[PDB]
Amino acid sequence: STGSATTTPIDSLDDAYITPVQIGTPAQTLNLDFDTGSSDLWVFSSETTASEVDGQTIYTPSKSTTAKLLSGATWSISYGDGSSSSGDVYTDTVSVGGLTVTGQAVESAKKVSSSFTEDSTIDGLLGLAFSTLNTVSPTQQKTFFDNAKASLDSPVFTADLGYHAPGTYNFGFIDTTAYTGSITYTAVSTKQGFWEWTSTGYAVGSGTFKSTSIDGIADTGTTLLYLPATVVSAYWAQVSGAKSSSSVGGYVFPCSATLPSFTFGVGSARIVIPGDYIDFGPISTGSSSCFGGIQSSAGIGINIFGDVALKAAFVVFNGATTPTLGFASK
């Protein structure tokens, strides 16, 4: 089997991407944020505290003939940005892009933090990291990808995110029309439950490539590119008037600037992030200070190749017995 679904930016900055997901019988379609940095499939629901719902579409298990309470199971998650959610668990039929899993754990939110409530466009998350990070207790649950894997034509999914445009998530096949040149594969460590890999270095603009190992994770659920403070200072030093602002919470730059590209290494291959991908616009409406898309990881504890970096590539998440990542230009 295979599946193929379009993923659409939630706003003009590509802050996140939503993908429609069918849950239950008859289908209830919710727009979920596919997150390769977490392992829970959770939704706004008929159980979510009413004051914490503001425009999201909700899953109502009582209206699904295939929903079953997973008795005694609870979940609770905290993300890198400080946001959180928790609740109980149903099993139900879940379909993405024509690919169906029966008996998928659907984690129903009873509580969500303010950042979720305030984002009316995101109806929940579909985690695509390794199932060792799933938060369901006392019986940990499998991701949608781990449940689908054995049925897929190939045990892979691909992320093809757009720059200010829709893109695609494919399951079970590699669309050879979706990229240019060849795919370069690189080793993955699953020790922390992430798609963790090691980049071979970087360049700023037309500068020379610096060969250096940068361990990090491929995370579709993170907007920006977070890298060591040495690398980030080297990038922003090439932009007149850029500075790190403790009041704003990272590097800002004059909105009149033209940003340089950023290149990262994947083995002997190179992925080039155009400068425009690094512009996240005014820090507040009408400001002439703009927020940067490359930021220091120093206060996180991990480097994160988020959407700024991934949208520059066709990315293969290979879930074979020895997992690997693949990157191609496009």
- Closest by CA to 211, choosing from 224, 202, 198, is 202
Distance of CA 248 to the CA centre of its chain: 23
Resolution rounded to one decimal, in angstroms = 1.1
CB-CB contact of 319 with 305 (8 Å) = no
* DSSP H or E run through 102: strand 99-112
- For 52, residues 6+ apart whose C-beta sits below 8 A from its C-beta are 111, 112, 116, 117
Residue with tokens 């929940």: 124
Using an 8 Å Cβ cutoff, are 132 and 193 in contact?
Answer: yes
Enumerate the β-bridge partners of residue 43. 108, 124
Domains located in the chain, CATH noted: 5-174 (2.40.70.10), 175-330 (2.40.70.10)
In Å, the largest CA–CA distance within the chain is 60
Please give the helix or strand (H or E) that residue 6 lies within, else none.
strand 3-9
Q: What sign does the dihedral 50-23-314-79 (CA atoms) show?
A: positive
Q: Look-up: residue for tokens 């994770």? A: 217
In angstroms, the CA 238 to CA 155 distance is 42
Q: Are strands 41-43 and 99-112 parallel, antiparallel or unpaired?
A: parallel
Question: Is it true that the peptide bond before 166 is cis, omega within 30 degrees of 0?
Answer: no
What is the C-alpha to C-alpha distance for residues 230 and 301, in angstroms, rounded to an integer?
Answer: 15
Contact 186, 329 (CB under 8 A): no
List 14, 35, 160, 307, catalytic entry: 35
In one letter, which amino acid is 64?
S
Report how this structure was experimentally obtained: X-ray
Active site residue 35: yes
Buried b (16+ CB within 10 A) or exposed e, 77-91: bebbeeeebbbbbbb
Q: Which of 38, 199, 296, 297 is catalytic?
A: 199
**The tokens of 311 are what?**
């949208």
Beta bridge partners of 125: 33, 42
What is the Cα Rg of the chain in Å?
A: 20
Whether residue 92 lies in the annotated active site: no
150: phi then psi, degrees, rounded to nearest 5:
-60, -30
Sheet holding 225-227, edge to edge: 269-273, 262-266, 196-204, 210-218, 303-305, 225-227, 294-296
CA–CA distance, 272 with 294 (Å, rounded to integer): 13
